[PDB]
Design a protein around this ligand. Structure first.
Ligand SMILES: [Ca+2]
Ligand SMILES: [Ca+2]
Length: 314
DNA sequence: GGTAGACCTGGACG
DNA sequence: CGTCCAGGTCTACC
């Protein structure tokens, strides 16, 4: 059929594949696990969302990642658009090599890794990542997903429509900085988070030097990046780490949330040493982050993604 | 300097 | 139905 979300079976000539074993990527363990909140399994095993300013549907077989794009006459994805997908999933990073290393230096990781292969980090846009996680504050993935769709629907560029779903690109800084945005977001149910969205958009455009400021952070060191980000309203240590890890190429960035705390205590019998508090606090969270870094190495943030994602399946 | 409490909400239970 | 919960952050105050 010419309409609705496609499936690999229904429109074969419209899909192109990318060599990618499931051991290197598990869409069902990455896409809905709290990295990006903009992917939906519209059809069993088929995930649709905006990628590189276009709508796509992705699905995998044992050795292939099948892709289709909705831009003109419908056609299979081109090699270049396909590279956009490989970039998004950072496929040049061999997951089996990381899993092996983490497994060698951490017996518990190896145990869990046996049943959760394919968890890697998406390489996201700084803007979407910054605002999606500002909304993650005291929030569950599903509610977060809801706020983000509404926020994009109301302020993002309109793309194409599949069935009764109209896709929207992520809002720009200018749109998020616009007048009465907060009030509109509040009506969209973002709660106090509405305030931070507006505030951080204005702060970036009117105080920090605009988009270029956020983007040039990719070249900065994790330490610098993380400090800069904590300036913005609504961006604390956790939100800042999520951003450094998922959007600024800071693989040693380790987000420390309630999940990681439970994991630390329950699976590593971890306790704060230099910290004053016994539970979550700005000092204990920092310490726990350094604990995971000393334990997993330069890509601790990625290792973190595996266990976090695995901890959601509980 | 290191906390306790305020700020929003739709599914979650008991 | 009423308290609890989820990828927190901010800040007046001890
Ligand atoms: Ca929480
Ligand atoms: Ca801040």
């Amino acid at each position: 059929s010419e309409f609705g979300h496609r499936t690999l079976a229904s429109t074969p000539a419209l899909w192109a594949s990318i060599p990618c074993p499931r051991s290197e990527l598990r869409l069902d363990l990455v896409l809905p696990s709290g990295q990006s909140f903009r992917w939906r399994e519209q059809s069993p095993a088929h995930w649709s969302g905006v990628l590189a300013d276009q709508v796509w549907t992705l699905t995998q077989t044992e050795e292939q990642l099948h892709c289709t794009v909705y831009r003109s006459q419908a056609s299979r994805p081109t090699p270049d658009e396909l590279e956009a997908v490989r970039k998004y999933f950072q496929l040049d990073v061999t997951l089996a090599q990381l899993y092996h290393h983490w497994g060698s230096v951490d017996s518990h990781f190896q145990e869990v890794a046996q049943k959760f292969q394919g968890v890697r980090l998406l390489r996201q846009d700084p803007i979407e990542c910054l605002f999606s996680f500002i909304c993650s504050s005291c929030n569950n993935i599903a509610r977060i997903t809801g706020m983000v769709e509404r926020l994009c629907q109301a302020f993002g560029p309109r793309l194409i429509q599949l069935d009764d779903v109209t896709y929207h690109g992520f809002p720009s800084l200018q749109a998020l900085a616009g007048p009465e945005v907060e009030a509109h977001l509040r009506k969209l149910g973002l709660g106090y988070r509405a305030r931070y969205v507006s505030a951080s958009a204005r702060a970036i455009l009117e105080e920090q030097g605009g988009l270029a400021w956020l983007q040039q952070l990719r070249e900065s060191s994790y330490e610098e990046a993380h400090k800069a980000l904590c300036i913005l309203p609504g961006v604390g240590t956790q939100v800042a780490d999520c951003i450094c890890l998922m959007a600024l190429d800071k693989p040693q960035a380790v987000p420390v949330d309630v999940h990681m705390w439970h994991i630390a205590q329950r699976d590593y019998s971890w306790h704060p040493t230099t910290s004053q508090a016994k539970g979550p606090s700005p000092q204990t969270n920092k310490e726990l982050g350094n604990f995971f870094r000393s334990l997993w190495g330069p890509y601790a943030g990625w290792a973190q993604a595996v266990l976090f994602s695995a901890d959601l399946r509980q």
